[model samples]
Target: MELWLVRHGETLWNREGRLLGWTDLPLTAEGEAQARRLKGALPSLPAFSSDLLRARRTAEMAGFSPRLYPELREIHFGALEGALWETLDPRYKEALLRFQGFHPPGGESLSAFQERVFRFLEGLKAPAVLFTHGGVVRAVLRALGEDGLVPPGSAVAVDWPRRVLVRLALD
Candidate 1:
């Protein structure tokens, strides 16, 4: 099945350029608008989202009340919770910046994160919408051999276990 992967709308943490992992935060006003715009851009389909508050809020606003999954959560950043990306230790910082190997203190290993995410992808039974996070969108793209970022509230369509088909910027 193909996948419709939608990153959650922007959050206060996002604007501040802070690391936003498991910590819960709501969408900003503009974020809500971004989510609403998604309704017009995406196909009506079975939906899912990370269990994080920001992701969940984005889903409802985007016209989908999704089934929540912790595996869909953004990679846990542990103590880096609100640390500025620029202020981080180069090792940990680059791990995040490059969105590659290197685990944070109390966070998940990059490989582990990908395993769970792809496991989720492998289990999908049909085309679906996933209200998730920036990192997740990146991971999916990276796994499919594409390297890029999608804006908040944007969605990427990918052929499961294959390649990225299209990207929708619901701005």
Candidate 2:
């Protein structure tokens, strides 16, 4: 099935370079503008979204009321909540830099998080638009053997368990 995987609009934490996982913040003014700008690209297709306020608002502003799913929320960063990445502990730094599957003291492990999201994706039976997080987008990309970061307020279309169809940059 075709899936349009969208990263939600920018949050204040995003501008601040903070670890934004599971913190649940609203979009900035520019973020709302970004959502409105992105609206034209999304048709009134079947939509699903992360339960976070930012993702939900993005869907609403983009002219959709998606089925909300907590499973689509960003990976829980655990003890890193609200902590600045630059000022984080050295071991945390090593783990992040190494891309070595860092498991926060109180958060979900990378494997577990991927399993949860991949399972959700595997369950989809049709083409749909998913308003989700950056990490979720990354997981899908990695699973498809692609490498890159999805810009905020943008989207990537993929044939599930197979090919990446297109990249939609809305910023």
Candidate 3:
């Protein structure tokens, strides 16, 4: 199955380099501009989006009415929802930088997050669009043995659990 994972646009936390996990921030003005660029870039397929305001709004602005899914949400940041990346403890920082081992206090584990994300993908019956978060997109790309970083409001298409098809970004 093919999947298009869109990382929602920039928010205040994003610009401040804070860890954004389930805080539900709205997109910044520039973020809205980024989303508009995707209006003609994505496929016209069944759409799904994280229930978070940002992801849902991105899907709508990109000209799609998507079914909302909590499973599509970013990894729960728990106590770290809005922690500044620059000041994080070395242990937590290293874990996140390496995408391994560390779990946020009162938050979801990396392993659990991956399992949840993959299980949702496994249930997809066909190619679809998923307006989700940075972490969710990263997990998918990492699973395909590729670098996971992407710009805000950007998207990546991949053959499920396999190779990347393309990466789409504006500016």
Clashing residue pairs in candidate 1 (N, C-alpha, C atoms within 3 angstroms): none
Measured by lDDT, the strongest candidate is 3
Worst 10 residues of 2 by lDDT: 93-102
TM-score of each: 0.95, 0.93, 0.98
**Candidate with the greatest TM-score versus the true structure:** 3
Compared with the true structure, the alpha-carbon lDDT of candidate 2 equals 0.87
Q: On a 0 to 1 TM-score scale, where does candidate 3 land against the true structure?
A: 0.98
Q: Which stretches of candidate 1 lie over 4 Å from their true place?
A: none
Task: Tell me the spans in candidate 3 whose CA falls farther than 4 Å from its real position.
Answer: none
Candidate 1 local Cα displacement, residue 133, angstroms:
0.6
lDDT of 2 by residue, 80-156 (tens): 98899789889877866544577998998878888999999999998899999998998888778887488888889
Clashing pairs in 3: none
Lowest lDDT block of 10, candidate 3 = 96-105
Q: Candidate 3 lDDT, tens digit per residue, 10-108? A: 888887999999898999998888888999999999999999998988999999999999999999989998999999999999998788986888999
TM-score quality measure for candidate 1? 0.95
| Residue-by-residue lDDT tens digits, candidate 1, 1-171 | 788999988998887989888999889999999999988688889999999998999899888879999999998888778889778888887776677786877888888998989899889988999889988889989878887588888889999778899999854
lDDT of 1 at 145: 84
